[PDB]
Coordinates of C-alpha atoms and ligand atoms in Angstrom, one line a residue:
Chain A
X413 CA 125.4 69.9 78.2
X414 CA 123.6 69.5 81.5
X415 CA 121.7 66.3 82.1
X416 CA 118.3 65.6 83.5
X417 CA 116.4 67.8 81.0
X418 CA 118.0 70.9 82.4
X419 CA 119.8 71.7 79.1
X420 CA 116.4 72.3 77.4
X421 CA 115.2 74.1 80.5
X422 CA 118.0 76.7 80.1
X423 CA 116.9 77.5 76.5
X424 CA 113.5 79.0 77.5
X425 CA 114.8 82.6 77.8
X426 CA 116.2 82.2 74.3
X427 CA 112.6 81.7 73.2
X428 CA 111.5 84.6 75.5
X429 CA 113.9 86.8 73.4
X430 CA 112.0 86.0 70.2
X431 CA 109.7 88.3 68.1
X432 CA 107.0 86.3 66.3
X433 CA 105.9 87.3 62.8
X434 CA 102.2 86.7 63.5
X435 CA 99.8 85.0 66.0
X436 CA 100.3 81.5 64.6
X437 CA 104.1 81.7 64.9
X438 CA 103.6 83.0 68.4
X439 CA 101.4 80.0 69.1
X440 CA 104.1 77.7 67.8
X441 CA 106.8 79.4 69.9
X442 CA 104.6 79.0 73.0
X443 CA 104.1 75.3 72.1
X444 CA 107.8 74.8 72.0
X445 CA 108.3 76.8 75.2
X446 CA 105.8 74.7 77.1
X447 CA 107.4 71.5 75.6
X448 CA 110.9 72.4 76.8
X449 CA 109.9 71.5 80.4
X450 CA 108.6 68.0 79.5
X451 CA 111.8 65.8 79.8
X452 CA 112.7 67.1 83.3
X453 CA 109.0 66.8 84.4
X454 CA 108.9 63.2 83.1
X455 CA 112.2 62.3 84.9
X456 CA 110.9 63.8 88.2
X457 CA 107.5 62.2 87.7
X458 CA 109.1 58.8 87.3
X459 CA 110.9 59.3 90.6
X460 CA 107.7 59.7 92.5
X461 CA 107.8 63.4 93.1
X462 CA 105.8 66.3 91.6
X463 CA 107.6 67.3 88.4
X464 CA 106.2 70.8 88.1
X465 CA 107.5 71.9 91.5
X466 CA 110.9 70.4 90.6
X467 CA 111.0 72.2 87.3
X468 CA 110.1 75.5 88.9
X469 CA 112.8 75.1 91.5
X470 CA 115.3 74.4 88.7
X471 CA 114.4 77.6 86.9
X472 CA 114.5 79.6 90.1
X473 CA 118.1 78.3 90.7
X474 CA 121.4 79.1 89.1
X475 CA 122.4 77.8 85.7
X476 CA 124.6 75.1 87.1
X477 CA 122.0 73.7 89.5
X478 CA 119.7 70.8 88.5
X479 CA 117.8 67.9 90.1
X480 CA 119.4 64.6 90.8
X481 CA 116.4 62.1 90.8
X482 CA 118.5 59.3 92.2
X483 CA 119.5 61.1 95.4
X484 CA 116.4 63.4 95.0
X485 CA 118.5 66.5 95.6
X486 CA 119.2 69.8 93.9
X487 CA 122.9 69.6 93.0
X488 CA 125.6 70.9 90.7
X489 CA 125.1 68.7 87.6
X490 CA 128.6 69.0 86.2
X491 CA 130.3 68.2 89.5
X492 CA 127.9 65.2 90.1
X493 CA 128.5 63.9 86.6
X494 CA 124.9 64.3 85.4
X495 CA 125.6 65.4 81.8
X496 CA 124.2 64.7 78.4
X497 CA 125.6 64.7 74.9
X498 CA 124.5 67.9 73.0
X499 CA 124.0 65.9 69.8
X500 CA 121.5 63.6 71.5
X501 CA 119.4 66.5 72.9
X502 CA 119.3 68.5 69.6
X503 CA 118.6 65.3 67.6
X504 CA 115.7 64.3 69.9
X505 CA 114.2 67.8 69.9
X506 CA 114.5 68.3 66.1
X507 CA 113.2 64.8 65.3
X508 CA 110.2 65.2 67.6
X509 CA 109.3 68.7 66.4
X510 CA 109.6 68.0 62.7
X511 CA 107.0 65.1 62.7
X512 CA 104.7 66.4 65.5
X513 CA 104.3 69.9 63.9
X514 CA 103.5 68.3 60.6
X515 CA 101.0 66.0 62.3
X516 CA 99.3 69.0 63.9
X517 CA 98.6 70.4 60.4
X518 CA 96.1 67.7 59.6
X519 CA 92.4 68.2 58.8
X520 CA 91.3 65.0 57.0
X521 CA 92.4 61.4 57.8
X522 CA 91.9 58.6 55.3
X523 CA 92.2 55.0 56.5
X524 CA 91.5 51.6 55.0
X525 CA 88.2 49.9 56.0
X526 CA 89.2 46.9 58.2
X527 CA 88.4 43.6 56.5
Chain B
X413 CA 88.8 82.5 107.8
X414 CA 90.8 83.0 104.6
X415 CA 89.1 81.8 101.4
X416 CA 90.4 79.9 98.4
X417 CA 91.4 76.9 100.4
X418 CA 94.1 78.9 102.2
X419 CA 92.6 78.3 105.6
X420 CA 93.3 74.6 105.3
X421 CA 96.7 75.4 103.8
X422 CA 97.8 77.4 106.9
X423 CA 97.0 74.4 109.2
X424 CA 99.8 72.2 107.8
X425 CA 102.4 73.2 110.4
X426 CA 99.9 72.3 113.1
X427 CA 100.1 68.8 111.7
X428 CA 103.9 69.2 111.5
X429 CA 103.8 69.8 115.3
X430 CA 102.2 66.4 115.9
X431 CA 103.9 63.2 117.3
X432 CA 102.2 60.0 116.1
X433 CA 101.7 57.1 118.4
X434 CA 102.8 54.5 115.8
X435 CA 103.4 54.2 112.0
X436 CA 99.7 53.8 111.0
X437 CA 98.8 57.0 112.9
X438 CA 101.8 58.7 111.1
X439 CA 100.3 57.4 107.8
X440 CA 96.9 58.9 108.6
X441 CA 98.5 62.2 109.6
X442 CA 100.4 62.3 106.3
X443 CA 97.2 61.5 104.4
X444 CA 95.4 64.5 106.1
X445 CA 98.5 66.6 105.5
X446 CA 98.5 65.8 101.7
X447 CA 94.7 66.3 101.6
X448 CA 94.9 69.8 103.1
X449 CA 96.3 71.2 99.8
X450 CA 93.5 69.7 97.7
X451 CA 90.8 72.5 97.6
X452 CA 93.3 75.3 96.7
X453 CA 94.7 73.0 94.0
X454 CA 91.2 72.3 92.6
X455 CA 90.3 76.0 92.6
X456 CA 93.5 76.8 90.7
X457 CA 93.1 73.9 88.4
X458 CA 89.6 75.0 87.5
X459 CA 91.1 78.4 86.6
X460 CA 93.4 77.0 83.9
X461 CA 96.7 77.3 85.8
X462 CA 98.9 74.6 87.5
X463 CA 97.5 74.1 91.0
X464 CA 100.7 72.7 92.6
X465 CA 102.8 75.7 91.7
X466 CA 100.1 78.1 93.0
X467 CA 99.9 76.1 96.3
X468 CA 103.7 76.2 96.7
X469 CA 103.7 79.9 96.1
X470 CA 101.0 80.3 98.7
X471 CA 102.9 78.4 101.4
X472 CA 106.1 80.3 100.5
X473 CA 104.2 83.6 101.0
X474 CA 103.0 85.3 104.2
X475 CA 100.0 84.2 106.2
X476 CA 97.7 86.9 104.8
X477 CA 98.6 86.3 101.2
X478 CA 96.5 83.9 99.0
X479 CA 95.6 83.3 95.3
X480 CA 92.7 85.2 93.7
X481 CA 91.8 82.8 90.9
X482 CA 89.3 85.3 89.6
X483 CA 92.0 87.9 88.8
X484 CA 94.7 85.3 88.7
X485 CA 97.1 87.0 91.1
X486 CA 98.4 86.8 94.6
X487 CA 96.8 89.2 97.0
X488 CA 96.0 90.1 100.6
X489 CA 92.7 88.1 100.8
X490 CA 91.1 89.8 103.7
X491 CA 91.5 93.1 102.0
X492 CA 90.2 91.7 98.7
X493 CA 87.2 90.1 100.4
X494 CA 88.0 86.4 99.6
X495 CA 86.9 85.0 102.9
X496 CA 85.2 81.8 104.0
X497 CA 83.0 80.8 107.0
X498 CA 85.0 78.8 109.6
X499 CA 82.0 76.5 110.2
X500 CA 81.8 75.6 106.5
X501 CA 85.5 74.7 106.3
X502 CA 85.5 72.6 109.5
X503 CA 82.2 70.9 108.5
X504 CA 83.5 70.0 105.1
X505 CA 86.8 68.6 106.5
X506 CA 85.1 66.6 109.3
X507 CA 82.3 65.2 107.1
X508 CA 84.8 64.2 104.4
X509 CA 87.3 62.6 106.8
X510 CA 84.8 60.7 108.9
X511 CA 83.3 58.7 106.0
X512 CA 86.5 58.4 103.9
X513 CA 88.7 57.0 106.7
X514 CA 86.0 54.5 107.5
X515 CA 85.8 53.6 103.8
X516 CA 89.5 53.0 103.6
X517 CA 89.2 50.3 106.4
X518 CA 87.4 47.9 104.1
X519 CA 88.6 44.4 103.1
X520 CA 85.5 42.7 101.9
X521 CA 82.6 44.1 99.8
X522 CA 79.2 42.3 99.5
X523 CA 76.8 43.4 96.8
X524 CA 73.5 42.1 95.6
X525 CA 73.7 40.2 92.3
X526 CA 72.1 42.3 89.5
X527 CA 68.9 40.7 88.2
Ligands
LIG601 N1 120.6 60.8 88.4 C1 120.0 61.5 87.5 N2 119.3 62.6 87.9 C2 118.7 63.3 87.0 N3 118.5 63.1 85.6 C3 119.2 62.0 85.3 C4 119.9 61.1 86.1 N4 120.5 60.1 85.4 C5 120.0 60.3 84.2 N5 119.3 61.4 84.0 C6 118.7 61.9 82.8 O1 117.7 61.0 82.3 C7 117.7 61.0 80.9 C8 118.0 59.6 80.5 O2 116.8 58.8 80.3 P1 116.7 57.5 79.5 O3 118.2 57.1 79.2 O4 115.9 56.4 80.2 O5 116.1 57.9 78.1 P2 116.6 58.5 76.7 O6 118.0 58.8 76.7 O7 115.6 59.7 76.4 O8 116.2 57.3 75.7 P3 116.6 55.8 75.4 O9 115.5 55.0 76.0 O10 116.9 55.6 74.0 O11 117.9 55.6 76.3 C9 118.7 62.0 80.5 O12 118.1 63.3 80.2 C10 119.7 62.1 81.7 O13 120.3 63.4 81.7
LIG602 N1 88.0 85.0 93.6 C1 88.3 83.9 94.3 N2 89.6 83.5 94.4 C2 90.0 82.5 95.0 N3 89.2 81.6 95.7 C3 87.9 81.9 95.6 C4 87.4 83.0 94.9 N4 86.0 83.0 95.0 C5 85.7 82.0 95.7 N5 86.8 81.2 96.1 C6 86.9 80.0 96.9 O1 86.2 79.0 96.2 C7 85.5 78.2 97.1 C8 84.0 78.2 96.7 O2 83.7 77.2 95.8 P1 82.3 76.7 95.5 O3 81.3 77.7 96.2 O4 82.0 76.5 94.1 O5 82.2 75.3 96.3 P2 81.8 74.9 97.8 O6 81.6 76.0 98.7 O7 82.9 73.9 98.2 O8 80.4 74.1 97.6 P3 79.0 74.3 97.0 O9 78.9 73.8 95.6 O10 78.0 73.7 97.9 O11 78.8 75.8 97.0 C9 85.8 78.7 98.5 O12 86.9 78.0 99.1 C10 86.1 80.2 98.2 O13 87.0 80.7 99.2

């Protein structure tokens, strides 16, 4: 798939085409929708530029256009070779979500008293 | 002038039409140029939205269009009444710059030892 976090950026309208069952499911869908911009934002922030403007410029562009943080330019990602494995992206997303959504269900935390 | 920090936002091409004498003057001009977006960003950030995207949408718009953070939408701001005194804007800019650029010239700081 496309590299630079653009592959997760192109799946936001798939979440926009979802009908939640209730308000809490809608909250979770919005959480994932806001999370989907995080890798591209982090890559752009590590390059010294403002990641939100870069992310908005990526979503306002065509589906083949992403941000090259090395050259700092908006390019064709397949033609420039900036590509990612699909397995890596889905594995990272699923493994992050499964533990973080379970962590957010907590009300009580029990720890050992430090000796 | 226009309110919402847009009056300082419309003076950025006036800085783009400047020729610095050396590199340090260029650094100072860039400092003021980056500072000119700060009040609109702060107003948008206090409203719960991302201020950088709002600022970019303001500069991509016409000269009469700004952001109403009360209604959260982009409007003709003379017609909507969001206006500022010119004296207040220039007083704030000059009073901030005069002390802050002198503060940034410091190399040594001498303080009294706390008793
Ligand atoms: N020139 C580039 N422009 C834009 N994005 C790029 C560029 N080169 C790599 N990337 C992106 O940066 C990410 C790679 O980051 P990095 O390899 O440091 O971390 P990771 O793969 O998440 O984890 P790990 O630390 O295990 O390697 C991928 O999303 C890749 O598509
Ligand atoms: N509805 C609005 N939409 C957008 N900007 C607005 C709106 N109402 C006011 N503003 C802007 O917000 C700023 C006013 O902020 P505020 O009065 O809290 O601070 P100040 O004038 O800098 O200082 P002081 O605390 O001394 O009043 C002005 O720039 C004004 O144009």
